[PDB]
A paper describes a structure:
The PEP complex is composed of a prokaryotic-type core of four plastid-encoded subunits and 12 nuclear-encoded PEP-associated proteins (PAPs). PAP7 belongs to methyltransferases, PAP10 is a thioredoxin (TrxZ) while PAP4 (FSD3) and PAP9 (FSD2) are both iron superoxide dismutases (FeSOD). SODs are cellular defenses against superoxide by catalyzing the dismutation of superoxide into hydrogen peroxide according to the overall reaction: 2O2– + 2H+ → H2O2 + O2.
Five molecules of PAP9 are in the asymmetric unit. Four of them form two dimers. The fifth interacts with a molecule from another asymmetric unit to form also a dimer. The buried area calculated using PISA in the dimer interface is 1785 Å2. The C-terminal domain (Gly94–Gln229) displays an α/β fold with a three anti-parallel β-strands sandwiched by four α-helices and the N-terminal domain. No electron density is observed for residues from Arg141 to Glu155 and for the last 29 residues from Gly231 to Asp259 suggesting flexibility. The catalytic center is at the interface of the N- and C-terminal domains. The zinc ion is penta-coordinated by the His31, His83 side chains of the N-terminal domain, the Asp182, and His186 side chains from the α/β fold domain, and a water molecule supposed to mimic the position of the hydroxide ion.
Numbering used by the authors:
A (entry chain A), B (entry chain B): 1 to 140, 157 to 229
C-alpha cells in the first residue's frame, strides 16, 4: 500500500560544530554526514520490497541478529542504531561525573567512579579493530562494560545499553588521527552526557521492574 | 647475551610518493609512517624480555595464533607482517593483467581473469569492518580468495598468501574517504604488482613441490 520513507537519519541533538574543539565540525560532517547517512541509506536499500520499515530499528536489529549467524540487514541496522545512540551519548559541556542513582550503581558494581572510568577507558582502548565499547544494564551485578566487534551491540543479548563510544577509526581520525587513547580520554572528560545515561538507566530499570509485574 | 633491535620497519620498495595519484604521499606517511610503524613498535615492546625476536615474523604469527585463541603478540605481529606484504603487493605503474603461469592458474580456478577480478573486488568490498582480502595458494582448486577480519592472515591456515588488499579504514580515508569500492577498483586497476604475485606463486609451488620429499 502507501509506502514509507524507510528509516530516517536523525541529526545529532546539537549543532554540528557544538562539540568543538573536542570533536570538530569536520568530524560530524564526515562521521554523521557520510558514514551514518550511508548506513541508513544502505539499510533502506536492503529492505526494499519488505515490510521491515514497519518495525522499529531496534526490532530489525534483533530480528536479523539470528543468534549470531547474522542476516543481510544486520550490519546496517545495528550501525544505524549504534550511531544514533552515539550522538545522543554526548553533549556540549559533557564530561565530569554522574550523580544520583547512576553514580551509586556505578560505585556498587565497580567500587567507585574512578575504577569504573579506568576500566571503561581501558576496554575501549583494547577492543581491537572496528567496534564499540558499552556501559550496559542487565536485569536477568547490574552494570557491565561490554566490548563488541564491528556493528554488534548488547541489545543482541538483552542488555540495555546506557553509554557507548564508537572506536571505528572513522570516529576519531580527523581529530586524533591514530591516537585512540587520546580520543577515549577526551570523550570521558569533555563529551559524555551523564544526564542522558541516567535517563537511559531509569528506563532500563522501569522495563525490568515492569517485566516482573 | 647480546641484544637485538627487534623487528624493523621496512620501508615500501618505492619512494613514498611513487604511488600518486592512486595512493597519496599523505596516505603513505600516515599508513606506513604511523600505523605500520606503531604495529612494529608495539610488537617490539610486547616481546621485550623474551627471545621471540630471534624468530621470523611468520613464526611469531603462527606461534601466537594458538588455533584461534590468539596470544597477546598476535595482532601486532600479524599486522606487521600484513603491512609488509601489502606494500610489496603494489608498485608504481601496477595494474593490468597477470601473465604466464599466474594468469593460467587464475583462469583455471576462476574461469577467467575478469571473473577472478570481480570475485576478488566483491570479496574485498563485502568484508565488513576492519580486515584484509587475499589471493592465496594452498597445496593441500589451488588458488582461493580469502577474507580475514582485523589482523588475521591466511598463513594461520597454512595457505601461502599471494596478494592482499588492506581494507582497514586507515588504508583509504585520505584518498577515497569512505568510498571503499572505489579504493578497491583503483587498487586492482593501477597498483597491484602482478610480477610480485607471480614471484610469490613460484615460491609457493616450490615449497609444495619440496614438501613432497
Ligand atoms: Zn561510526
Ligand atoms: Zn593498514
Amino acid at each position: 500500500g502507501v509506502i514509507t520513507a524507510g528509516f530516517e537519519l536523525k541529526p545529532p541533538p546539537y549543532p554540528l560544530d557544538a562539540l568543538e574543539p573536542h570533536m570538530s565540525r569536520e568530524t560530524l560532517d564526515y562521521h554523521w554526514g557520510k558514514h551514518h547517512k550511508t548506513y541508513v541509506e544502505n539499510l533502506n536499500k536492503q529492505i526494499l520490497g519488505t515490510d521491515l520499515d514497519a518495525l522499529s530499528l531496534e526490532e530489525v536489529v534483533l530480528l536479523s541478529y539470528n543468534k549470531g549467524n547474522m542476516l543481510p540487514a544486520f550490519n546496517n541496522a545495528a550501525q544505524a542504531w549504534n550511531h544514533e545512540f552515539f550522538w545522543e551519548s554526548i553533549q556540549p559541556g559533557g564530561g565530569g561525573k554522574p550523580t544520583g542513582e547512576l553514580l551509586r550503581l556505578i560505585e556498587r558494581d565497580f567500587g567507585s567512579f574512578e575504577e569504573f572510568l579506568e576500566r571503561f577507558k581501558s576496554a575501549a582502548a583494547s577492543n581491537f579493530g572496528s567496534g564499540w565499547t558499552w556501559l550496559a544494564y542487565k536485569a536477568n551485578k547490574k552494570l557491565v562494560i561490554v566490548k563488541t566487534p564491528n556493528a554488534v551491540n548488547p541489545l543482541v543479548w538483552d542488555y540495555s545499553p546506557l553509554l557507548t563510544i564508537d572506536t571505528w577509526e572513522h570516529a576519531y581520525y580527523l581529530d586524533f588521527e591514530n591516537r585512540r587513547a587520546e580520543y577515549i580520554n577526551t570523550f570521558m572528560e569533555k563529551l559524555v552526557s551523564w544526564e542522558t545515561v541516567s535517563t537511559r538507566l531509569e528506563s532500563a530499570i522501569a522495563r525490568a521492574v515492569q517485566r516482573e509485574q
